[PDB]
Structures are given as structure tokens and as C-alpha cells.
Scaffold this motif. Structure first.
Motif, PDB file in Angstrom:
ATOM      1  N   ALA A  19       0.819  -1.206   0.000  1.00  0.00           N
ATOM      2  CA  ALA A  19       0.000   0.000   0.000  1.00  0.00           C
ATOM      3  C   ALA A  19       0.856   1.262   0.000  1.00  0.00           C
ATOM      4  CB  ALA A  19      -0.932  -0.021   1.211  1.00  0.00           C
ATOM      5  N   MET A  20       1.954   1.262   0.754  1.00  0.00           N
ATOM      6  CA  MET A  20       2.820   2.438   0.790  1.00  0.00           C
ATOM      7  C   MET A  20       3.504   2.702  -0.552  1.00  0.00           C
ATOM      8  SD  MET A  20       4.417   3.779   4.224  1.00  0.00           S
ATOM      9  CE  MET A  20       3.818   3.713   5.918  1.00  0.00           C
ATOM     10  N   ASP A  23       1.949   5.564  -2.777  1.00  0.00           N
ATOM     11  CA  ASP A  23       1.883   6.908  -2.211  1.00  0.00           C
ATOM     12  C   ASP A  23       2.811   7.865  -2.942  1.00  0.00           C
ATOM     13  OD1 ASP A  23      -0.095   6.257  -0.395  1.00  0.00           O
ATOM     14  OD2 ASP A  23       1.253   6.028   1.327  1.00  0.00           O
ATOM     15  N   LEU A  26       0.768   9.002  -5.614  1.00  0.00           N
ATOM     16  CA  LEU A  26      -0.276   9.897  -5.135  1.00  0.00           C
ATOM     17  C   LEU A  26       0.269  11.305  -4.932  1.00  0.00           C
ATOM     18  CD1 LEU A  26      -2.346   7.844  -2.496  1.00  0.00           C
ATOM     19  CD2 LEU A  26      -2.921   8.305  -4.887  1.00  0.00           C
ATOM     20  N   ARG A  29       0.488  13.004  -8.195  1.00  0.00           N
ATOM     21  CA  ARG A  29      -0.813  13.414  -8.707  1.00  0.00           C
ATOM     22  C   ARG A  29      -1.273  14.716  -8.058  1.00  0.00           C
ATOM     23  NH1 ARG A  29      -5.501   8.825  -8.840  1.00  0.00           N
ATOM     24  NH2 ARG A  29      -7.208  10.092  -9.723  1.00  0.00           N
ATOM     25  N   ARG A  33      -1.873  18.396  -9.950  1.00  0.00           N
ATOM     26  CA  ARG A  33      -3.120  19.124  -9.749  1.00  0.00           C
ATOM     27  C   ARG A  33      -2.851  20.548  -9.291  1.00  0.00           C
ATOM     28  NH1 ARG A  33      -5.076  15.015  -6.227  1.00  0.00           N
ATOM     29  NH2 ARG A  33      -6.205  13.310  -7.261  1.00  0.00           N
ATOM     30  N   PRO A  80       8.762  22.922  -6.547  1.00  0.00           N
ATOM     31  CA  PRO A  80       7.748  22.780  -5.504  1.00  0.00           C
ATOM     32  C   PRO A  80       7.114  24.122  -5.194  1.00  0.00           C
ATOM     33  CG  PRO A  80       9.817  21.759  -4.864  1.00  0.00           C
ATOM     34  CD  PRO A  80      10.105  22.594  -6.043  1.00  0.00           C
ATOM     35  N   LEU A  93       3.738  23.070   2.048  1.00  0.00           N
ATOM     36  CA  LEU A  93       3.658  22.797   0.619  1.00  0.00           C
ATOM     37  C   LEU A  93       2.250  23.105   0.122  1.00  0.00           C
ATOM     38  CD1 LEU A  93       5.871  19.579   0.630  1.00  0.00           C
ATOM     39  CD2 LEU A  93       6.358  21.770  -0.366  1.00  0.00           C
ATOM     40  N   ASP A  95      -0.478  22.245  -1.602  1.00  0.00           N
ATOM     41  CA  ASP A  95      -1.181  21.130  -2.201  1.00  0.00           C
ATOM     42  C   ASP A  95      -2.516  21.596  -2.787  1.00  0.00           C
ATOM     43  OD1 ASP A  95      -3.379  20.612  -0.166  1.00  0.00           O
ATOM     44  OD2 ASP A  95      -1.533  20.819   1.066  1.00  0.00           O
ATOM     45  N   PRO A  96      -3.152  20.772  -3.645  1.00  0.00           N
ATOM     46  CA  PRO A  96      -4.247  21.304  -4.484  1.00  0.00           C
ATOM     47  C   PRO A  96      -5.397  21.940  -3.715  1.00  0.00           C
ATOM     48  CG  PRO A  96      -3.561  19.133  -5.243  1.00  0.00           C
ATOM     49  CD  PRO A  96      -2.910  19.340  -3.924  1.00  0.00           C
ATOM     50  N   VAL A  97      -5.921  21.304  -2.669  1.00  0.00           N
ATOM     51  CA  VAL A  97      -7.058  21.914  -1.983  1.00  0.00           C
ATOM     52  C   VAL A  97      -6.642  23.183  -1.252  1.00  0.00           C
ATOM     53  CG1 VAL A  97      -8.913  21.556  -0.312  1.00  0.00           C
ATOM     54  CG2 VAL A  97      -8.176  19.707  -1.839  1.00  0.00           C
ATOM     55  N   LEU A 130     -12.513  19.304  -4.464  1.00  0.00           N
ATOM     56  CA  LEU A 130     -12.865  18.182  -3.598  1.00  0.00           C
ATOM     57  C   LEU A 130     -13.643  17.126  -4.360  1.00  0.00           C
ATOM     58  CD1 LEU A 130     -11.723  18.396  -0.970  1.00  0.00           C
ATOM     59  CD2 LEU A 130     -13.926  18.951   0.064  1.00  0.00           C
ATOM     60  N   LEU A 133     -11.460  14.629  -6.884  1.00  0.00           N
ATOM     61  CA  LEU A 133     -10.288  13.840  -6.521  1.00  0.00           C
ATOM     62  C   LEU A 133     -10.320  12.448  -7.120  1.00  0.00           C
ATOM     63  CD1 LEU A 133      -9.761  14.897  -2.845  1.00  0.00           C
ATOM     64  CD2 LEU A 133      -8.601  15.680  -4.882  1.00  0.00           C
ATOM     65  N   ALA A 134     -11.500  11.875  -7.325  1.00  0.00           N
ATOM     66  CA  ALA A 134     -11.612  10.531  -7.890  1.00  0.00           C
ATOM     67  C   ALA A 134     -11.803  10.515  -9.407  1.00  0.00           C
ATOM     68  CB  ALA A 134     -12.774   9.763  -7.238  1.00  0.00           C
TER      69      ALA A 134
ATOM     70  N   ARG B  83      -5.380   8.401   3.493  1.00  0.00           N
ATOM     71  CA  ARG B  83      -5.621   8.411   2.064  1.00  0.00           C
ATOM     72  C   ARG B  83      -7.098   8.621   1.767  1.00  0.00           C
ATOM     73  NH1 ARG B  83      -2.555   3.594   3.007  1.00  0.00           N
ATOM     74  NH2 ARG B  83      -0.340   4.018   2.640  1.00  0.00           N
ATOM     75  N   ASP B  86     -11.575   6.240  -3.684  1.00  0.00           N
ATOM     76  CA  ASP B  86     -12.765   6.287  -4.515  1.00  0.00           C
ATOM     77  C   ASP B  86     -13.686   5.135  -4.121  1.00  0.00           C
ATOM     78  OD1 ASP B  86     -11.959   3.895  -5.788  1.00  0.00           O
ATOM     79  OD2 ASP B  86     -11.492   4.867  -7.686  1.00  0.00           O
ATOM     80  N   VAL B  92      -6.831   7.625  -4.160  1.00  0.00           N
ATOM     81  CA  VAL B  92      -6.731   8.696  -5.140  1.00  0.00           C
ATOM     82  C   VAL B  92      -6.009   9.935  -4.617  1.00  0.00           C
ATOM     83  CG1 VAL B  92      -8.814   7.871  -6.244  1.00  0.00           C
ATOM     84  CG2 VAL B  92      -8.960   9.691  -4.576  1.00  0.00           C
TER      85      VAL B  92
END
Ligand SMILES: [Mg+2]
Ligand SMILES: [Mg+2]
Lengths: 436, 437
Positions: A19-20, A23, A26, A29, A33, A80, A93, A95-97, A130, A133-134, B83, B86, B92
Motif C-alpha cells: 500500500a505504501m 503513495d 499519489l 498526482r 493538480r 515545488p 507545501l 497542495d491542491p485543496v 474536492l 479527486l476521484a 488516504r 474512490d 486517489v
């Protein structure tokens, strides 16, 4: 026998480390954005960009970033993006939001309180980002693509433009020009070369749009962060605006602003800068006026004497701007700049005609004079400019939408509000006084 | 004249840009700590249960997940990367602080009523708050080499600076010693269970009024910054009080299962019967149908298939938590209700409950019968009958969603008091209390 954690086997490490692994992607991505948001912010505020450090105030935060690749179409490559405190120390940093929240705060503040972007049910750019994101991330330019394959795709995209009456006028910016920026940023080809190629593919089509796209100095785009008319339900409802046309030539042979002759009680003459010594009393007059608070609150050029002295000299030596002293019945009361739009920041903001003229104005002796005088001087200057240059189609101005007295002075003088426009430090009402 | 779209590079430029790049790793860690603090508050203020291992939750428009590596007895949990997922469970995004603040804000504003201060057109948002704080001096971290004895030392000094009677801020315990136990625990300096024991001792000694309370009450006062009808952000949060479970509290009392109340008059009540054989019996069928009608499902959100319901009712009937019942009115079976022990329920972290406290969820299936105002009369009858059925019960409670104002009003007409709004895992509720005294 761990009550505050999970007892660990190699299998647990395996699962969690798998899983890591994603990231890293991520974070990339989120980088892509935030960069997209920042490119839009720069285009929609018409902020100029050079290679090197970029530093911006966006709403509540100072943002800075290295411009590693400066793109002729705005598809810049950034290092950055960081938030700085008042002393210039990086504290986060961008970040997008975070950017979406800063941009939303800045934009809602730029437009008027009664504007649709500030309506209670209008949504915000934060809701939009928001909600997205998906969404499936768009495929990147193949890092190994050849220039020829790039030209190949770019021709196919030019030829697939509808070119038929009732076509989307922003399709050129959104299609071929956006693709050119992506090829350039990927290091696939020089965007200047790709623009020349684009010009050729357009000269052949010989459509209505293709002749237009090659001659006009601006193009239609769509704004997603700046614009009084924006909505997010929660998806963005973009609004039209104009951007510089990358296919359009540089300096035209347009003469400098003329010296008009005002009627009524007004007098006008150009600023005089002595090469000798202090610079003279005109430099001092402007310097004094520009440092009074009511003037600096609009012009924000409360500079020292010498900075102003060489601004005025620089203007006088150019073909762009003509600084003038305005009298009212023998008293020197105002300063104005008459400028050719074709050499001005306004040239990226609306489909101007080559001789278009603009006015910046600062009323210096309001502290002892003037009520109702505003509209009268503005009318006198507009008409007198149309008299002085018979080839000039309109006189224009860009008061801050928040400078409500100035906007009203312009409208009472006969300028019409054509649109709101986004500028590096403000949104303006584009006031137009047209020849008939 | 070599690079027009870039800056000509020398070693000095690379040096300048690499120094700036050195601090970015700490910037990423600072966003990590900020997001973790936000998530801890979200979990506490919504009373979301937390266990070691994977945690998954809906926050406004986004699904969030994270590994709970360290599950803290005081809620100062330690997380792996947070995280955004989705719908299919694919990550994501990383949940950085302003993203979290925006989802929590959207969720919280949605939980409270439109008339609440948190929803005023002039109120701040958690996004304004988090944005305004990026340039705050970051809080000191617990020294990784601190000794356990130094931890006890600091913790003892801190209980001693508690106001006692003057001032009497009730949330000082959670904000002082307990917050420090959490930081000590999360840093690995000492076991929080042991530090809680130490805390109990320093508290028995003073034996003032507050100290007796802090050892006996099943809840403590805390202050909320994300969930709460009265929240305001004046580029800075104006918190609101709420209750959290007391980590110093024992509990685990010998409380019996819910009693069967006896309603007189036009009402009848009995427990649900679940047939071991086949379909499940006629009562599982009635509950299944009712719970799938639109007016009931719109609130209970349990419009399940017949088989799931048959196993729900059986699981309740076999436990000590909840008792499902069928209510009749003049011979017609018209409603379903659950009588539940608060001490075994999600409510127990939300207010200073007594061990025998009882709750009611109710669903009116046959609205076609007793069509108006009889709702409050049934609620009043049930409250009184439950108070009769368990002489040690201090109060009957209920937690309708604050947005279900028709239900809130029915409860109030029955004699319940809307005592407060509370944050629950999936909703904010009006805590309706029908008190015995
Ligand atoms: Mg092990
Ligand atoms: Mg070099």
C-alpha cells in the motif's frame, strides 16, 4: 500481545508496504493538480511569468515557486510550490485543496459582493476540487515521443476543429494550443517551433476561423477560478474571457499616444523631466500626489522621488504611455497616463483595436477641490482623444470593481461597462467610450 | 544567450535550490502532524470507535482510510498515511490538512441545522481556520529520549496546576494531564494505562470536589473544534463544550438487559418473536416490510432484505443491549421500537449517563392508523412504563437526528427535553431526555 497495536508478522509488513508503494504516485498526482490550478490562476489574472522565482500573494497566503520552464502558452513547469510566512519562511507545501482555498478566497474577494460567484448557493472552487479527486487522471505526454509524431497529432487536432459557424471560439486554446504546451513541458519540442507549424496548418484551412485565428491579437478562453459569474454545483460552470494570442505578431507600427487638447475648464500638458539634477517640479508633483494615501490606495505606487523620476522618464522615452499634468482653472490638480493598449497589459484582456487608447487617472487636489468634477474631466479626455487620433476606435479604462466612485464617474462620462476582467492585483470594470 | 524558457544553471544556482529543497521533507512531516491532529478531533467529536488496524470512514464528499498503528486510551492515536479512496477502494489522494479541513467542514455544516451558528452566512469555516494557522509556530514535540520518570514528574506538576474550585473549567482535565498522557503514550515514553493509574492516585489525594467527580463520572468535558452547532471561526476557532468518555472511569457494571415495559390503555407492547424455522416468522416479516416503506427508511436507513433483518432481530434478542418490540394500538400492530441500555450503546460516550439509563428508537409503520398526534402519546406512555419497569433507571433518552424535527417535536411534547446536540458516527442528534426527577 499488543493491546494498543496489531501484532506484527512479515505478512502484515508486506500488506502495508505494498500500500505504501503507490503513495509516491499519489504525491505526484497532487503535484500535477496544484500545478494545473496555478497555471489557471496565472492565466486568469493575466499575471506575467518569467523564468526564475515567482512570488505571489493569493488570498490569505504568500505563495512562491521556481519557474523552471516558462511556456509561451502558459503551460509552465514549476519546482515545488510553497507557502511562505511574512518573513519569507516556508511553512507548508501548496497542495491542491490548499491552493483551491486560497484562490477561492482571493477570487471571491476580487469580485463585488453582489456578484454571482459570491451568492450563498454558488459553491466554491474548494467544493469543485474536492468533488474531483476521484476523476480519472489524464494520460501524460509519452516522455519518448518524437517531434514528428507531435506534429502529426497537432495537425490531426487542427483539422478536426469544426471551423463552421457556431463553433466554440475557445476550441483553439483548449485543443491545439493546450497540446502544444504539454509537448513543450514534456521537452518534446520547442513551443515556438510548434506554433509556427500551427500557423501553417491554419493558413491552409482558409476558413472563417482560420483567417481570424491568425490575425486577431486575443483568443477566447474559459475561466475556472477568476470571474464574477462563476458557479460550482459542485462542478465548475466556466465563464468566457480573453487571453493573448500566441500566433499574433509583436510590436505594431502604432504611433505613441497623442497629446489631446481638452475643452471646458481643463488644461493638459505632458510631464517634463529635467535631465539635470532633481528631475524638476513635475516629478515632484507626481511623487507628492502618488504618496498621499487616497492615491496610493488605488495606484499603489507610493515610491521614492527617484523611482518616480525614472518611471516618468522611461514613459516619455517610449511609445506606450504618456504622463500628463491636468489643470483646472489654473490649478494643477490631477495626473493621468494616456497609453496605447497595443503596448499595455490590457492587450491580453480584450479584443482591442490597434489604436485603442486608455486612461489611468489620479486626482491629487481633491483634498481642497472637486465634487462632480470626476465625470467632466473623464468626458473631456475621452472626446479629446478621439479628436486627436481619428484612427482610434475607443477610449478604455480598468478601474477596480471596488473603486465604485471611479466606476460611476466613468459611466456618467459615457464609458460603458463591457465586462469584468482579471488583472494581476485586482479585478476591474472594463469601461469603454466608443467612437460613433 | 542559451536558455530562453529557463535560467542558465551554474553550481551556485543548484546550491540555492537544493538548500530550499532540504526543508521540504520537514514541511511534509508538518502537514502530516496537522492532518493527524484534525483526524483525532474528528474521531473524538463524532465519537467514532477506533481499534488497532485499518480505519475507514466517510467524511463529507470523500472516503478516508488510515492504519491505526497506535490506538491510544486517550484518543491520541498514531496513524499510517491518511488516504482518500474512490468508491472501489482505490487510493486517489493523500489527505493533507486543508483537504481534511474542507471535508470535515462540509460534513459538519451538513450535520447541524441550517439555523445553527456554524451555518450562518457570516460564520468562519474550519478551512479558514486551518489556512490562517499555517504560519503558526509549531507545537513542541515530546523529547524522544524523555524518561518515564520525567513523564511522571511533569504529569504530577500538571495536576497540581489544575484550578480546583476557582474558575472551575471542566475541560481542564482533558486539556492538561490527559492530553499529556496521550502525547507521552504516542511518543512511546510510557504506557498510557500506567500513566492513567498514576493520574488516579494524584487525584484521590486532594479529595476536593472536582477530584471526586473526575474519578466517578463516566464522561468528561472536552472542547470541540470541528463538530458542533455553535462553532465559529473568526480566523480562529471559538470552541464549544461536549462530553467524551472518561478514561479514568471503570464502568463495566452488572446492568441487566432492557426490561419489558407494560403499556396500559389503548397500547400494547411485546418483544419480537423470531422463528427458528424457515422464513423467520410473521414478526420478522412485519418489521422487514415496515423498515422498507419509504417514510420509515428515509430516517432509519435500514430498508434491508428479509434475511438480514431476521438475523438482526435474533442478534438483539439474544444480547443484553437492545430489545426489539412490536407495539399495538387498539388491537392493530402499528409500530416497532428498540429499548436499549445506554451503557452498551453508542450513546455512552456522549453524556454523563447513569448505568441503568434506557433508550428508545421508534418506527411508525401503520401511519394509516392513529394518524395524528398519537406519536407523542406513545412516546410518553413508553417512557413512564420503562421508568416503572426498572426502578433503578434514572431517565429514558432518545437521539433522533437533529434534522428530524418532527420527531424531535413529538419527543418534546411527550415530556422529553432537548438537552443538547451530540456528535455521533453518522449524524448529529438531538439528545432527548425524559428524566425521572
Ligand atoms: Mg510479533
Ligand atoms: Mg549552464
Amino acid at each position: 500481545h499488543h493491546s494498543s497495536g496489531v501484532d506484527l508478522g512479515t505478512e502484515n509488513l508486506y500488506f502495508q508496504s505494498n500500500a505504501m508503494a503507490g503513495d509516491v504516485e499519489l504525491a505526484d498526482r497532487a503535484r500535477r493538480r496544484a500545478c494545473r490550478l496555478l497555471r489557471r490562476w496565472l492565466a486568469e489574472t493575466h499575471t506575467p511569468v518569467e523564468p526564475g522565482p515567482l512570488s505571489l500573494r493569493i488570498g490569505p497566503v504568500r505563495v512562491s515557486a521556481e519557474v523552471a520552464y516558462r511556456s509561451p502558452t502558459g503551460a509552465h513547469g514549476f519546482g515545488p510550490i510553497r507557502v511562505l510566512d511574512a518573513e519569507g519562511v516556508p511553512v507548508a507545501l501548496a497542495d491542491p485543496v490548499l491552493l483551491a482555498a486560497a484562490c477561492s478566497a482571493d477570487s471571491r474577494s476580487r469580485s463585488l459582493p453582489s456578484a454571482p460567484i459570491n451568492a450563498p448557493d454558488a459553491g466554491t472552487a474548494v467544493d469543485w476540487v474536492l468533488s474531483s479527486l476521484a476523476d480519472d487522471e489524464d494520460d501524460e505526454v509519452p516522455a519518448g515521443m518524437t517531434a514528428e509524431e507531435a506534429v502529426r497529432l497537432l495537425s490531426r487536432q487542427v483539422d478536426d476543429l469544426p471551423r463552421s459557424p457556431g463553433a466554440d471560439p475557445w476550441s483553439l486554446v483548449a485543443g491545439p494550443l493546450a497540446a502544444i504546451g504539454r509537448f513543450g513541458r514534456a521537452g518534446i519540442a520547442d513551443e515556438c517551433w510548434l506554433l509556427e507549424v500551427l500557423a501553417g496548418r491554419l493558413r491552409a484551412v482558409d476558413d472563417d476561423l482560420s483567417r481570424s485565428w491568425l490575425s486577431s491579437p486575443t483568443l477566447a478562453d474559459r475561466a475556472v477560478l477568476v470571474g464574477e459569474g462563476l458557479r460550482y454545483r459542485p462542478d465548475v460552470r466556466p465563464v468566457p474571457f480573453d487571453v493573448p494570442n500566441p500566433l499574433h505578431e509583436g510590436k505594431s507600427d502604432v504611433p505613441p499616444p497623442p497629446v489631446p487638447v481638452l475643452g471646458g475648464p481643463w488644461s493638459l500638458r505632458p510631464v517634463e523631466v529635467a535631465v539635470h539634477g532633481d528631475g524638476g517640479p513635475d516629478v515632484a508633483l507626481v511623487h507628492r500626489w502618488m504618496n498621499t494615501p487616497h492615491v496610493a490606495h488605488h495606484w499603489n505606487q507610493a515610491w521614492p522621488l527617484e523611482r518616480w523620476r525614472e518611471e516618468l522618464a522611461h514613459q516619455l522615452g517610449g511609445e506606450h504611455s504618456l504622463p500628463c499634468v491636468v489643470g483646472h482653472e489654473g490649478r494643477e490638480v490631477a495626473y493621468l497616463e494616456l497609453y496605447r493598449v497595443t503596448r499595455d497589459k490590457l492587450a491580453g484582456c480584450y479584443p482591442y483595436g490597434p489604436h485603442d487608447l486608455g486612461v489611468h487617472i489620479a486626482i491629487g487636489e481633491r483634498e481642497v477641490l472637486g465634487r462632480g468634477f470626476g465625470s467632466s474631466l473623464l468626458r473631456a479626455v475621452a472626446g479629446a482623444l478621439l479628436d486627436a487620433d481619428p484612427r482610434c476606435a475607443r477610449v478604455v479604462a480598468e478601474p477596480n470593481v471596488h473603486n465604485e466612485a471611479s466606476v460611476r464617474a466613468f459611466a456618467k462620462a459615457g464609458f460603458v461597462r463591457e465586462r469584468e476582467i482579471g488583472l494581476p492585483a485586482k479585478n476591474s470594470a472594463l469601461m469603454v467610450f466608443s467612437r460613433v
